[PDB]
Amino acid sequence: NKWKPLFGKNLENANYNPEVWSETDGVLGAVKDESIWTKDEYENFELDLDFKTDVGTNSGVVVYCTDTKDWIPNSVEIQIADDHCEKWGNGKPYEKCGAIYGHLGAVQDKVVKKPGEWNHMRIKCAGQHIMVILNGKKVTEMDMSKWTSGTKNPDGSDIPSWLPKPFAELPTKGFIGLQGKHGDSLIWFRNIKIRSL
Ligand code: NA
């Protein structure tokens, strides 16, 4: 159908703490670690958002969340990361920007721009099929039905112990959220919007 702001105007359609999450000059950011969620559940949608990184940014967009309190194992996370910072060495493919965190790498990295440059990401969530388009590049295409294991990924890498639920049996409807600030690297969001497929 048509695009609408994911959180409405003035975050009216979001569940959040206003001491954590706020809009400044049209740009959403967080000063503490707690997440921001939609008040409503979504399936069969495309989500657009702009984001800007800091050096070493590690964040993510959460979709299909069936529990906003115990969200980590009951959701899918599209990784947002500063691929130009190499802190943990080479890193894992599922830690790169536009990956499905813990589950599936992006096909190329350093599609994300350098810290302080604006990025654009579109996430198409069509039941078990998730596509990530980053800066106009199709970087990630997951079919969740392949994830029959909660411990091992189709690419052979181990799934972090804190993500035990097989993605093949995960529901493909739930809340959408953004993650808060966990350390010194900031992240900024804008033009966060959604429409149905
Ligand atoms: Na992340």
CATH number at 187 reads 2.60.120.560
Local structure of 169: helix, strand or coil = helix
Contacts of 186 (CB under 8 A, 6+ apart): 29, 54, 57
What is the 8-class DSSP label of residue 113? Answer: P
Q: Please give the torsion angle defined by the CA atoms of residues 169, 40, 4 and 43, in that order, rounded to the nearest 10 degrees.
A: 20
Local structure of 168: helix, strand or coil = helix
The answer to whether the CB of 105 falls within 8 A of the CB of 129 is no
The structural domain count of the chain equals 1
Distance CA 195, CA 9 (A): 16
Q: How deeply is 173 buried, as exposed, middle or buried, from its count of CB atoms within 10 A (0-12, 13-18, 19+)?
A: middle
Which residue carries 């493909």 as its tokens? 172
The answer to whether the CB of 194 falls within 8 A of the CB of 3 is yes
- Candidates 76, 121, 130; CA nearest to 97 is 121
**For residue 47, what are the domain limits?**
1-197
CA of 57 to the centre of ligand 1 (A): 9
CA of 145 to the centre of ligand 1 (A): 22
The answer to whether the CB of 167 falls within 8 A of the CB of 153 is no
Distance CA 36, CA 22 (A): 10
CA of 88 to the centre of ligand 1 (A): 14
Distance CA 174, CA 153 (A): 23
Residues in the chain: 197
Helix (H) or strand (E) holding 163: none
CA of 13 to the centre of ligand 1 (A): 24
CA of 102 to the centre of ligand 1 (A): 9
What is the 8-class DSSP label of residue 160? Answer: P
CA of 54 to the centre of ligand 1 (A): 14
Distance CA 184, CA 191 (A): 24
Distance CA 28, CA 7 (A): 11
Please give all residues whose CB falls under 5 A of ion ligand 1, grouped by chain where several chains appear: 58, 60, 79
- 181 half-sphere exposure, CB direction, 13 A CA radius: 18
CA of 16 to the centre of ligand 1 (A): 19
CA of 162 to the centre of ligand 1 (A): 13
Q: How was this structure determined?
A: X-ray
Q: 18-34: string of b/e by CB count within 10 Å (b at 16+)? A: eebbeeeeeebbbeeee
Report the DSSP pairing between strands 187-196 and 36-38.
unpaired
